Structure formats: C-alpha cells, structure tokens
Amino acid sequence: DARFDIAHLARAELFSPKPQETLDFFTKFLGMYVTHREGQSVYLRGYEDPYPWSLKITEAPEAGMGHAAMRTSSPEALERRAKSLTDGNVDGTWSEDQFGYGKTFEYQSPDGHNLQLLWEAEKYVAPPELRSKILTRPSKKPLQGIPVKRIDHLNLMSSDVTAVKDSFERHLGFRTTERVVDGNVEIGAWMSSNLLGHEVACMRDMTGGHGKLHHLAFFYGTGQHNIDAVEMFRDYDIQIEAGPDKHGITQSQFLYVFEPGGNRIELFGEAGYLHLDPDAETKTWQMSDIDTGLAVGGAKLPWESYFTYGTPSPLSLDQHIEKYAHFPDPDALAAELSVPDELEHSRAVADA
Amino acid sequence: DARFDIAHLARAELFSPKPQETLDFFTKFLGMYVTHREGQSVYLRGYEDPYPWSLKITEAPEAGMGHAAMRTSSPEALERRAKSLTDGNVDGTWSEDQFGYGKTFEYQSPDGHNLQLLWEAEKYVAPPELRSKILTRPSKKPLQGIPVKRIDHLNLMSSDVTAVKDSFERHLGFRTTERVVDGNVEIGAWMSSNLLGHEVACMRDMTGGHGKLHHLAFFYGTGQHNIDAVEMFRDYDIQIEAGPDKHGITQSQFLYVFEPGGNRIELFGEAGYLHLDPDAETKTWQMSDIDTGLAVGGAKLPWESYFTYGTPSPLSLDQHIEKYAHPDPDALAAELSVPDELEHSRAVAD
Amino acid sequence: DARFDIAHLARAELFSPKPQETLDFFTKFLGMYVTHREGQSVYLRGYEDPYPWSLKITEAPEAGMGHAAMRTSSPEALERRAKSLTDGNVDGTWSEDQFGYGKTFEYQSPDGHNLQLLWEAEKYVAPPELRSKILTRPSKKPLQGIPVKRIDHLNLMSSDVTAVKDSFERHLGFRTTERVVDGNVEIGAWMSSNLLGHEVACMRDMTGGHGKLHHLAFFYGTGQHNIDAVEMFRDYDIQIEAGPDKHGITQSQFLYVFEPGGNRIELFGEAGYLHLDPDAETKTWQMSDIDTGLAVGGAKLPWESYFTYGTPSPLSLDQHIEKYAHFPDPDALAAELSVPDELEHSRAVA
Amino acid sequence: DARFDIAHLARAELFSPKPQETLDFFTKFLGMYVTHREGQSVYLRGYEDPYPWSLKITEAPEAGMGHAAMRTSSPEALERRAKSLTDGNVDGTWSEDQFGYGKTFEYQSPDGHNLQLLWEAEKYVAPPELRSKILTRPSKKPLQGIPVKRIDHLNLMSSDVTAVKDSFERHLGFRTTERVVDGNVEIGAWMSSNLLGHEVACMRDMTGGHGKLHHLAFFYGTGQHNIDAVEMFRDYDIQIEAGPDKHGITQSQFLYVFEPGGNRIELFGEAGYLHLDPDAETKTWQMSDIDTGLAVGGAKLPWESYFTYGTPSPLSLDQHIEKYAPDALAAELSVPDELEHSRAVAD
Ligand SMILES: CCc1ccc(O)c(O)c1
Ligand SMILES: CCc1ccc(O)c(O)c1
Ligand SMILES: CCc1ccc(O)c(O)c1
Ligand SMILES: CCc1ccc(O)c(O)c1
Ligand SMILES: [Ca+2]
Ligand SMILES: [Ca+2]
Ligand SMILES: [Ca+2]
Ligand SMILES: [Ca+2]
Ligand SMILES: [Ca+2]
Ligand SMILES: [Ca+2]
Ligand SMILES: [Fe+3]
Ligand SMILES: [Fe+3]
Ligand SMILES: [Fe+3]
Ligand SMILES: [Fe+3]
Numbered sequence A: 001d002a003r004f005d006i007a008h009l010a011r012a013e014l015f016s017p018k019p020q021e022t023l024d025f026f027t028k029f030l031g032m033y034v035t036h037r038e039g040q041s042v043y044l045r046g047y048e049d050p051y052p053w054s055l056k057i058t059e060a061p062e063a064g065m066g067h068a069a070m071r072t073s074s075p076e077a078l079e080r081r082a083k084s085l086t087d088g089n090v091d092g093t094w095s096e097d098q099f100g101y102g103k104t105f106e107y108q109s110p111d112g113h114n115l116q117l118l119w120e121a122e123k124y125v126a127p128p129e130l131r132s133k134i135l136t137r138p139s140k141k142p143l144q145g146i147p148v149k150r151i152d153h154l155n156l157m158s159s160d161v162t163a164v165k166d167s168f169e170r171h172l173g174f175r176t177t178e179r180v181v182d183g184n185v186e187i188g189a190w191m192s193s194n195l196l197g198h199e200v201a202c203m204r205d206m207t208g209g210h211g212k213l214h215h216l217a218f219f220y221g222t223g224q225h226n227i228d229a230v231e232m233f234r235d236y237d238i239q240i241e242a243g244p245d246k247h248g249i250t251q252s253q254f255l256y257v258f259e260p261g262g263n264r265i266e267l268f269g270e271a272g273y274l275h276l277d278p279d280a281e282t283k284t285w286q287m288s289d290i291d292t293g294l295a296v297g298g299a300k301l302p303w304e305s306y307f308t309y310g311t312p313s314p315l316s317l318d319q320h321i322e323k324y325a326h327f328p329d330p331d332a333l334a335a336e337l338s339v340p341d342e343l344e345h346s347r348a349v350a351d352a
Numbered sequence B: 001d002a003r004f005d006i007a008h009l010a011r012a013e014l015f016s017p018k019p020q021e022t023l024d025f026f027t028k029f030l031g032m033y034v035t036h037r038e039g040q041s042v043y044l045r046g047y048e049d050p051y052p053w054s055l056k057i058t059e060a061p062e063a064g065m066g067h068a069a070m071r072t073s074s075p076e077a078l079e080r081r082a083k084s085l086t087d088g089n090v091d092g093t094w095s096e097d098q099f100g101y102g103k104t105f106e107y108q109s110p111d112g113h114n115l116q117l118l119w120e121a122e123k124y125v126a127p128p129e130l131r132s133k134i135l136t137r138p139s140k141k142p143l144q145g146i147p148v149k150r151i152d153h154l155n156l157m158s159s160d161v162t163a164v165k166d167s168f169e170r171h172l173g174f175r176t177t178e179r180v181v182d183g184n185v186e187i188g189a190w191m192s193s194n195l196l197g198h199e200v201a202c203m204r205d206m207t208g209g210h211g212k213l214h215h216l217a218f219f220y221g222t223g224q225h226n227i228d229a230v231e232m233f234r235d236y237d238i239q240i241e242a243g244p245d246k247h248g249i250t251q252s253q254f255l256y257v258f259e260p261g262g263n264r265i266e267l268f269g270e271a272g273y274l275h276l277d278p279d280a281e282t283k284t285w286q287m288s289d290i291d292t293g294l295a296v297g298g299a300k301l302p303w304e305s306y307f308t309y310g311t312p313s314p315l316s317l318d319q320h321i322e323k324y325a326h327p328d329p330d331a332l333a334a335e336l337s338v339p340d341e342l343e344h345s346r347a348v349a350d
Numbered sequence C: 001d002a003r004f005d006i007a008h009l010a011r012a013e014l015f016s017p018k019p020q021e022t023l024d025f026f027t028k029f030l031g032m033y034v035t036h037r038e039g040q041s042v043y044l045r046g047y048e049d050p051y052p053w054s055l056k057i058t059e060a061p062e063a064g065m066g067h068a069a070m071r072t073s074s075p076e077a078l079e080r081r082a083k084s085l086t087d088g089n090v091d092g093t094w095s096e097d098q099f100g101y102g103k104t105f106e107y108q109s110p111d112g113h114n115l116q117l118l119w120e121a122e123k124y125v126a127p128p129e130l131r132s133k134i135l136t137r138p139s140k141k142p143l144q145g146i147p148v149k150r151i152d153h154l155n156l157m158s159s160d161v162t163a164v165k166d167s168f169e170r171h172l173g174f175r176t177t178e179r180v181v182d183g184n185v186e187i188g189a190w191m192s193s194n195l196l197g198h199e200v201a202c203m204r205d206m207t208g209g210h211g212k213l214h215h216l217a218f219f220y221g222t223g224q225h226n227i228d229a230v231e232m233f234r235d236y237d238i239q240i241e242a243g244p245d246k247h248g249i250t251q252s253q254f255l256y257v258f259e260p261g262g263n264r265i266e267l268f269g270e271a272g273y274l275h276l277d278p279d280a281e282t283k284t285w286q287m288s289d290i291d292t293g294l295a296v297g298g299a300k301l302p303w304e305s306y307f308t309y310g311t312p313s314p315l316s317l318d319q320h321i322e323k324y325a326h327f328p329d330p331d332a333l334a335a336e337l338s339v340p341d342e343l344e345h346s347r348a349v350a
Numbered sequence D: 001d002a003r004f005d006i007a008h009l010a011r012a013e014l015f016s017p018k019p020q021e022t023l024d025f026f027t028k029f030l031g032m033y034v035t036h037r038e039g040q041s042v043y044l045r046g047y048e049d050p051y052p053w054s055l056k057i058t059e060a061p062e063a064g065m066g067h068a069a070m071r072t073s074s075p076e077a078l079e080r081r082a083k084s085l086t087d088g089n090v091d092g093t094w095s096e097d098q099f100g101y102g103k104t105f106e107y108q109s110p111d112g113h114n115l116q117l118l119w120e121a122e123k124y125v126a127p128p129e130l131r132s133k134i135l136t137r138p139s140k141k142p143l144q145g146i147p148v149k150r151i152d153h154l155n156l157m158s159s160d161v162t163a164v165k166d167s168f169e170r171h172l173g174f175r176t177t178e179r180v181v182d183g184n185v186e187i188g189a190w191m192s193s194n195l196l197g198h199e200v201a202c203m204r205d206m207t208g209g210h211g212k213l214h215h216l217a218f219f220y221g222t223g224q225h226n227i228d229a230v231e232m233f234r235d236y237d238i239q240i241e242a243g244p245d246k247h248g249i250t251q252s253q254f255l256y257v258f259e260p261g262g263n264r265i266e267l268f269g270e271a272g273y274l275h276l277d278p279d280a281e282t283k284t285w286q287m288s289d290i291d292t293g294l295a296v297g298g299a300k301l302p303w304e305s306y307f308t309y310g311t312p313s314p315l316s317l318d319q320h321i322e323k324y325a326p327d328a329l330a331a332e333l334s335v336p337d338e339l340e341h342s343r344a345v346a347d
Helices: A019-029 A075-087 A161-172 A223-235 A290-294 A317-324 A330-338 B019-029 B075-087 B161-172 B223-235 B290-294 B317-324 B329-337 C019-029 C075-087 C161-172 C223-235 C290-294 C317-324 C330-338 D019-029 D075-087 D161-172 D223-235 D290-294 D317-324 D327-334
Strands: A006-016 A033-038 A041-045 A055-059 A064-072 A092-095 A104-108 A114-118 A150-158 A175-182 A185-192 A200-204 A212-219 A239-246 A253-258 A264-268 A283-285 B006-016 B033-038 B041-045 B055-059 B064-072 B093-095 B104-108 B114-118 B150-158 B175-182 B185-192 B200-204 B212-219 B239-246 B253-258 B264-268 B283-285 C006-016 C033-038 C041-045 C055-059 C064-072 C093-095 C104-108 C114-118 C150-158 C175-182 C185-192 C200-204 C212-219 C239-246 C253-258 C264-268 C283-285 D006-016 D033-038 D041-045 D055-059 D064-072 D092-095 D104-108 D114-118 D150-158 D175-182 D185-192 D200-204 D212-219 D239-246 D253-258 D264-268 D283-285
Touching: A006 A019, A006 A150, A006 A212, A019 A041, A019 A055, A019 A223, A064 A075, A064 A150, A064 A212, A075 A092, A075 A104, A075 A114, A075 A161, A150 A161, A150 A264, A161 A175, A161 A185, A161 A200, A223 A239, A223 A253, A223 A264, A223 B223, A239 B239, A317 A330, B006 B019, B006 B150, B006 B212, B019 B041, B019 B055, B019 B223, B064 B075, B064 B150, B064 B212, B075 B104, B075 B114, B075 B161, B150 B161, B150 B264, B161 B175, B161 B185, B161 B200, B223 B239, B223 B253, B223 B264, B223 C223, B317 B329, C006 C019, C006 C150, C006 C212, C019 C041, C019 C055, C019 C223, C064 C075, C064 C150, C064 C212, C075 C104, C075 C114, C075 C161, C150 C161, C150 C264, C161 C175, C161 C185, C161 C200, C223 C239, C223 C253, C223 C264, C223 D223, C239 D239, C317 C330, D006 D019, D006 D150, D006 D212, D019 D041, D019 D055, D019 D223, D064 D075, D064 D150, D064 D212, D075 D092, D075 D104, D075 D114, D075 D161, D150 D161, D150 D264, D161 D175, D161 D185, D161 D200, D223 D239, D223 D253, D223 D264, D317 D327
Parallel strands: A006 A055, A064 A114, A150 A200, A175 A283, A212 A264, B006 B055, B064 B114, B150 B200, B175 B283, B212 B264, C006 C055, C064 C114, C150 C200, C175 C283, C212 C264, D006 D055, D064 D114, D150 D200, D175 D283, D212 D264
Antiparallel strands: A006 A064, A033 A041, A041 A055, A092 A104, A104 A114, A150 A212, A175 A185, A185 A200, A239 A253, A253 A264, B006 B064, B033 B041, B041 B055, B093 B104, B104 B114, B150 B212, B175 B185, B185 B200, B239 B253, B253 B264, C006 C064, C033 C041, C041 C055, C093 C104, C104 C114, C150 C212, C175 C185, C185 C200, C239 C253, C253 C264, D006 D064, D033 D041, D041 D055, D092 D104, D104 D114, D150 D212, D175 D185, D185 D200, D239 D253, D253 D264
C-alpha cells in the first residue's frame, strides 16, 4: 500500500535564460523570500513553504524544469519508493548536494522529466523580526507585490500521458483524481497522494515534444489575489495567457502568465475541491464534458499557446504563437489533427 | 448648466419572445421581486431599487429594449430637459400610464432608441415581513439565486455613436467620461450625469443596424457575485458570452450572459472607478490603448457576438454566431469597417 | 502506523427540540439537500458531500450531538481501529442501521461523546437533472440561501481535553496540529488524520460539564460566503455569536451562529492552512500567544457563550447568557477563576 | 439650490507627534505615493487621487486634523459657498499657499474643525514609467503594502452634531443621508453632496471635548483588501480597533486602526449603497434600530475607544483606554443603554 508514501511537492527548479528578470518576477511581483544564492542559482520560498526553499532559479541557455522533488511521509517510504523504481528498471542516483535538504533520490519520468524523492528537509525558521503571530505561519507575509504562500503543483507535458501517469500510480502510489480522454488516448491526468486534487498533472504534448514543463503553480488560497495579480501583471508588462477564472477540472481558481524567462507560471486562488472520499473513482472528462473542464466562466484558453507551448521550447514564445496561429506549418496541422475538435473548437478555446 | 438635471437610470423594459423563460431568469437566477403584472407585461425590482419597478418584461415577437427611463433631480429639471429637446426639434410625447410612476416625457434617440424622462416616482415600501434592519435597504435580500441589488446601466448600439453622444451631452447635460475612437470615428462613448462611470453607453453597430440594445446591466457591488452568478449560469444552462473579468474602460467587473429571450444581460461586481473629479477630461482609448479597455485580465470578448449582436437581431443568436464566425459578404463588410487592433486584439476571440 | 487509518469526518447527528425550525435553517439558509426521513429524523447533505447524508436532524427534548462518524481509508483500517479501542478496554458495539452506510463501530469518547467508525458508505448519485457539469461535484449548487458544500469539522467540549486527545492520537492515529495550554493543562486540541488543520477539535468545558458539543462546522471555501451568510442571518433573525473573521489557530475563516434548536453552527470560508509538511511539530499557543489565536482581525468572542455554552446545556441559551453575563452566580465565578485572565480579558474576548 | 456646489473631499492634513512612523504607515502599509516634502510636512496621494496630494502629514506636538478641503463643482460654486458662510457670520480666510492647488477659503466648523473649500486643483500627471494602461487611473497601483486607491471620507467628533450638520446642510448644500438619534439629540450624521453615503460624518464627543477628528478614511473598493490590511496590521504591530465588518449605517465595509501618531484611520472596502434616488428621506436610526447600524456581522465596537477617543486627545490612546475601561460615568449616563449595551459594543 504505497498510497500514503508521498507527502507533498517540496520544491522545483526553473531554468531561465533571463535569470535576473525571472528572479525579479518572483520577488517583486510574487513577494517570495530569497534564502540562498550559490553558483548560477538563487533559492526562494513563499512565506508558508516549510523548508528553506520551494523554488530554485538557475541560469541556463533555455527555459524549463531543472527538477521537481516530492517529500515522502517517512524515511522508510523513501526506501520503498526508490526500491520500487529501481526494481522497475528506472535508473536512479543518490545525492545530497542541496541547501536545506538531505539524502535525495534522482530519476527521470518515462518522458525525461527530472524527478526527485527525499525525506530529509530542514524546517525553515525565520529570523526573529520575520516570525508570525500565526504559529502555523513560519514567516510574515511580505509587503512586496501580491505574495504567494507556497508552491502548489506541477504540470508536466508528455508525448505519452499514460506512461507518466502509470509511473506515478505504480511506483509512487498516486491516485488519478481526474483525467481528460479522447477515444482511448489520455490527453490529461491529475494525480495526488493526498486530499489535494493534484500536486502533479501531465498533459499531452501535441507538438510531439518530450519531457517539457507545462507550468509550475503557486498558491494564494484567495480568488481576489488572482484578480490583484492579473492587474499587477497587466500594468507591469507581464504577458497574461488566460484567467482569472475557475477550471471545472480540479475546481481550481487559476491565472496563467509567462515569467520573463519564458516559463508558464500559474497562480491558484481558493483550494477548491478536497478529495475527502478515500475511494472516489477517477472522474473522466470526455470531449462532450470538455468545455466546463477548461473554464466554468467565459475564459478561453488560447489554442496557440496553452495546448502546444511548454519549456524548453525549440521556439521563442513569440515564434511559437506565430507558428501555431499560422502568422500553414505541417507541424501546426499535425497538432490540429491529433487534437479532437470538441477540445480544439470548444467555447473555452480561442484560436488566433 | 444642465450637468445635474438627470439623477439616475430608473428603469428599462425588455421585449422577449419567451416571456416566461425571461421572467424565470430574473426571479430564479437574479432573485428579483415581482411587484405587478398587467396585460403582456411583468414588473420587477432588485431589493435596493427605490421605485416599485426597475425592470418590465413585455411579451413581443422579437427581443430588444421597449424603453429606458431616467429620473431627473427635480420637477424643474424635467421641464428644462424636455424644453431643451423640443427646442432642438426632437418630437416628444407626454404620458402617465405606468404603475409606480407619474408624468413621463417619451422621445427617441437619434438612432431610434425609446428614451424617457420623469420626476414622479413612488418610493417602494416593503410589506412588514420583507423590511430590512439596514435602513437604506427597502427590502430584504432574497434567499433565491444570486440576487441583484438594482438596475445599473444601459448600453445602446447605434449606427452613429457621435449623434447619440451629442444628444445626451447637449440635451441631457451628460458628460462623456471615456470613449473609444478609430481615426475620426467614435466606436464607443460612456456617459454619466453623476459619479458613476456611466449609466448610459453607446457602441457602434458594426453590422450597420439601428436603434438596438447592446445590454442592460444589473448591480451586485461584489466581484465574487459575478463568480457565483457565472457558476450558476454554467450549471443551469444559460449561455455565457464573456467574464467574469474587469473592463479597463470604466474599471467595472463584468459578466455577460444571454437571457432565454435573446437579450444580453450584464452583471456588475464592484462599482470600480468613481468620478469624484468634477472636470476630468474625457479619456480617449485609441486602437493602441485598446487591449486593456476590453479586459484587464485574460478575458476575450467574442467578435462573433460582442461587436455584432444586439436586440432586436434579424438573426437568432445561434444563426448570428454561425454567420459572423462563418464567407458572408456582410460579415466581411463588418470585418473591413472595424480596425484590426480592435478585431485582432488579444482581448477578442474569433 | 495508524496515521492514515482515518480518511475524514463523514457525518454528524444533531438533536433539536425545535426540529422543523432546525430543518428550515439547514434547507432555507444553508441550502442542504434532504435525502431521507426515518422515525423522528431527517437526513441531509451539502451539494459536495459524497455520501447520501452528512447531517442527521433528530427530534429530542434537548439539543446536542447524537453522534459523529469518521470514515476509515480501508475496511482493514476499520478492523485495526476497532481492535485498538477494544484492546484499550473501550466498550464498542457493531451496528448497521443507518440509511446510505454499512457496518459501523459505535463507542464513546473518554468524556461520553458518541463516536463511530465506518468504511461502508454509498456514493450519492443525483437525479439526472441535478447532476453538475463539474464532474467532482455530485449535485448542482442549489439556488436556495447561501448553500454549504459539505460537512467540515466537529468541536467537542470536554471536562478533560488530554483524555479526548490521547484517545484520537493513540486509538485513531490522529495528530494534534495545534493546541492551547494554560500552565500544564491543555484547554484546546485541534486534531487531523489528513492535510486539514482539524476535523476534530476538543476544548475544555469551563463549567465542569461533560460530553457536550461546542459546534458543528460546514464548509463554503470562500470568505465572501461567510459575509453573505452573516447578512442573511442578520436580516432573517438568526442569533450571530462572532465573525466573520479568521482564527489564528487553523487559519480558518469562521462565522458562528446558533441554529433555532440551540446548537452552535460554524460556517468556514477559505480552507486556510494545509498541513503539507508530514512531520511538523504541534504548534502550542500559550496565554501570551492567545489573542491572534482567537481572531486575526478585530473580532471579539463573547465570554458569556463561546467559552461556557455547549449542547446539551442545563440552561436555555438566553438563561445561559443571563447567568454568565451576571444579568453573581458562584458557578459563573468558579468558571471565571478556572480560566486564565490573558484568555478571559484578551482583546479577542468581550 | 446649493445641492451640487460641492464635488468631493479633496484632501486632509494629519498632525503627528511621530511624523516618520506616520509617514512609514501610509507608504509601507498603505502604499501611498510621496509627491512633495516642505518644512515639517510630507504630501502623499493614493494611486487614483486626482490631485498631487490627498494627505499631508505634519509634525506637531499632538495628533489631530490640520484641515480638510472640499473641492467645489465650479469656481462660481466656491464664491457662492464662501459667501453663504460669511453671510452666516462664519470667520473665513482666503489663502493660496499649498503645493498642487490654488485659491482656498479656510473656515472653522461650529465646533472648531479646520475646513477649506477650493476650486483650483492641479491634475496629477505621472512620470511616463508610472502611467497606467487603465486610462482613468493616473498612476500604477504600487507593489508596496495593500495600497489605498484614494481618500474616502472624514468623520468629525463634535460637542454638538446638529450645529455641524446644519453648517454642511445650510452653507454647503449637503444632504444628511442617515443619522443616529437619541430622543431629540443627534449622536451621528452622515452627509453627502453626491451619490456617496457620506464624505463627511459627525459623531457626538461623549467626553465633552470639541473639534476632534474621529477618523480619516481611505478607499480600497474590495472587502478582501480590509482582510489583507488587518492581517498585515496584526503581524506588523499596528493597533486594530474593530473590523473587518460592514456598517449597517452607509452599508460600508470598514476596518479601523490607529496609525503610530495616534490618529484613527479607517480602510473602506466595497463602496456599498449609492444614493441614486435624488429625494430619499434621511434614514433615522433610533436605539431600537442601533445594533445593525454599527455592524451587520458579529463585530463589537469598543466603548472605551470608539465612542470616546478622538484626536487631539488630552490622554495617550493607552491612558484613554485605561480611563474609559467621574468623566467615564458622565459619558456612560449621557449615552442611551441600547447603544452602550448593544450586542455591537464591547466594554
Ligand atoms: C485544464 C484543467 C486544469 C486544471 C487544473 C490545473 O492546475 C490546470 O493547470 C489545468
Ligand atoms: C468595452 C468596455 C465596457 C466598459 C463598461 C461596460 O459596462 C461595458 O459594457 C463595456
Ligand atoms: C479558538 C480557535 C479555533 C480554531 C478553529 C476552529 O474551527 C474553531 O472553532 C476555533
Ligand atoms: C457607526 C456607523 C458608521 C458608518 C460609516 C462610517 O464611515 C463610520 O465610520 C461609522
Ligand atoms: Ca482536430
Ligand atoms: Ca479590420
Ligand atoms: Ca434510527
Ligand atoms: Ca480568570
Ligand atoms: Ca475672517
Ligand atoms: Ca447609559
Ligand atoms: Fe495547473
Ligand atoms: Fe456594460
Ligand atoms: Fe470550529
Ligand atoms: Fe467612517
């Protein structure tokens, strides 16, 4: 019974070709605290992240995810999960080289995403002047930007959603709370080891790419903060993809923006739907279900980015939107033909 | 100085070919109180509308606005406004035939919209069991749907925005707070006689049509109520056009839906930007300004309805969206008349 | 490792001497669905409660909690927890007499609270016309009142908080996320088996009573809905105890009211602080810590009800408030002397 | 017909004996822009204040209101209002000595409050990098604190509420939208020249004092910003008096705090009830009406500060709360018990 072996998503690393601008996004707009700098990397936490960092920004020639690490529910759970992966012929490596954390198992998803498992995590203790009167809160909410509380979840792009889902289910004990299917093909899976709808999702890469990041998400817990965040991004020249609105899938209040390095960042409002029922069936969204899945309100997710752009991208975001909006390309048409039309021409999709 | 002669938008009448479904939308979803029924009409108010009705639903073979009435700030202001219109060769009629109101001056905008001015308005008094402990609140907030407080504003579609704007400015003393221009052509004007951004707007009908209703708006004052409303509309099968989001123009939180009779209804969240500065210049939105004007967030206003559909429509809403989403030489004529920064804005979906 | 054996709080039963008024509170104000009636009981769920009921209202001569049931994470977990309790000399009984559920283990807390454990629970299926387009949502959000999504948590009053806490920790595998201490005495414990701050809390009965209910809580997930709920309760004559505000303890947005039968009901806004860190130390609130624990904002929790009234009460709520506000009683003064003054004269207490 | 002669509340000046801490409160917590410094004063605006300042912070030995200025609807309206006041034997002064503004009429309320009228007001224009894409918004919302949009309203404490009300009604053309009465005594009056419930209120000073400031208020327009603001104030050691909640009177979402200099500041959420009906009767709140007037929710307004403390105060805030938790008893006997022992009052 692996169900309870993974506790939560501890941290993630973003690659940025504009590391200072990425850093300024996370500090000046999202009010994250800087806890460490070393080499070409800067380490940040939200004010309610429990460990010394949840986000690592690393200078790189391209955008994308350096890794994501999940924290286990015990040291024994870490041994059981690492052994399951090894016995499943997954190549792993043991490391202990990150500030604030100990012994870490590194491996790749079936599509090449860098994933990590750990137990050993230091509990962040604030300097006295940053301690909160709220005792569950390890540091005061900053006075900068619209500050995020913590990391929320990860959305991976895969050439094969089922292979990534089966890895999380079989080796990590995750359940799939919700998925989107087109005939017999899984094009999205939302997975969790706890009450959350998901901490890890996987969506089909319609461009044939491998091992990409769709988005990293941070948590506000309040829908208004997405309204405040989008008004900030609009007036301070950050590109907005879609939202604020509410996904039918997970019932999460969402806002998607592009940080200056080109990674897609999601801001999450109200937690939404907690999976208290311990043996709920997977909810499967068909193409007849699909419209509400994307957005309860009037929001339209752009075809030319949402369904096709992740990081690293062989094209700039501008070049990507150009190509997939046809500003035809055989690649763009291949993507269009692989996607079912109820999804492609949904009232919750706009095609530039 | 006509600046202060119009107090507010008192009421509007919608025509509906599905009058019971229209009624059910306003009572079951928007929790409006029914205060009267007469002939082919039902009369409603939101719980903070001050007079016995703000909304009249009238059975008709087509959708659209039967009329809108503005209340003046005094009986003398009513005489001054009616005289200004008469002296400007606007042909008006005096009537006194509506429940809850008295003497009314009826006239047409330059584009044929049925407009009215009145002073005499009964103050709604609730039955004892519906009185509020909040003394400015004339009736308890209902326990039905996501209830609207009151009427908010009117958006008129016109072949000629400037002619409609000039009428409100010159004859009613309105100021234009904000407008959208493309070269020398005004494609929208937002007009007010008070601190509100607007109680009356006028937007260019890009199909060349005349005298249509773009939308009637009702007020919540809370952005969350647009979120609650859109979830209600989504799960109870009302068509949603755009929002919830926030218009840069007026800084209003908006949600646009179609009531079953085909009229566009807007739900307004937070009041937004109050015009306290008594001599602010008109803010002119160009096509370089335009994206934020439509929506601060990621909302996309559909080309195929928002810019082209109003009531009455020579086409059904489904037939309209079919035609303007495609080609039709009429749809292409509309596309060529609209500037591309507006047409291909990141705040427009085709 | 019992940590993961309990999944969540499935349901609770309230006793009411005004059963029809209690039912009207939960249906007309809180928009709960009625799924079953049997004997002198009615069974209700919120629109996102997974089983056919989360709330049972039972006619009785006094208010209070008939029982609360927790659902296990497997059938094996139910056998393990029942065996732990039996091996600990706790008297249990096996039953299967409730609509929508199967085999149930009934036992009493160390202070006499009726607690139950079960695995077998039917999944509620709505009639076709009440199914949601939101596939995690088993039934549409109703158009009545400010509807609650689901049951949230339980707050038990005990003569001995530690005895109740040790039962949940040792027999059910709960962790204590937060607690309030006065010297060496635990006067509150907040306990969870999952990411929630708590599904079960226990607070010290300062009157020397045993086995009472402090409150049952339902979930909105949205702070505005506590604002909407309190405005509804205010204008429709429900007694409001405190809030809306936010507890420092759990970081939960709260509103406390009394349902007409005399039970204290809490409405919860935003989920607040999720316990993602699997081995966080218990956070201990002292009397120097205390003010923020009660309320982040300006809310004052009334001494004369919050700290002293639970159900069943030897007095009516009005008689209770009379006695503990001294409208002195040696019993009221005994309660005052047992409570530390930092708690009693906190800026978060009136 | 003076009804339309006053447009809005342009600005106010606060006195502070802790001028730097007061400044830090308005910049670090409330995100106000500093536009000028001169002598012992600093000038600030919210990002949607139309003129170069709405707030002036002035070093002084005691807290309180230096002045409040209302903007008229025309230059002629300024001449008419000034003439009405002088014809009523009110002592007025003409001045033109403030940054961002021109010709000003200064006078005192019947109770000694420093009030001003002006027409001439410069329109603030942001530097290019601070201009908003929202064209009605003259400067970007700052990235600092929970920033206020603009000044909202003023609440004056008076030994005689009726005398202050009569001045605003008869000389400035304000209407009283709502008031609280006890028998034939006005305990509160909420006054407006526009759709707002009020831009000026006056409440009875139960201590027998004269000419005090109860509070100055700033606008968010969003209830959540009061929630965000109170959490900020709680964790950064600002004293919170009451709220967040909603006043039945005006239907305004409110939060009351003390800035470090001792002045009471109110943060306003949703605008609430707009007075569109041009000839609504004044709504009179009795002592049977009273509970909802104070707070729709569970909020309790503290007797020991809310009903008795204003600036300048002969006592520190701490000394005031100490005393009001013969003078305290005189205050208690003058206040009717339905107000004093309301479920919306804490002692
Ligand atoms: C399209 C549905 C969905 C749901 C939850 C997410 O966090 C997300 O990015 C997308
Ligand atoms: C397109 C800008 C705009 C602004 C305010 C409105 O009420 C509206 O309907 C439209
Ligand atoms: C006194 C702190 C507290 C915290 C959370 C609750 O749900 C509650 O009822 C009380
Ligand atoms: C006590 C009622 C009330 C109403 C509006 C306010 O601005 C205020 O400060 C007080
Ligand atoms: Ca296709
Ligand atoms: Ca064009
Ligand atoms: Ca039974
Ligand atoms: Ca004591
Ligand atoms: Ca003089
Ligand atoms: Ca008294
Ligand atoms: Fe996501
Ligand atoms: Fe509108
Ligand atoms: Fe509780
Ligand atoms: Fe105020």
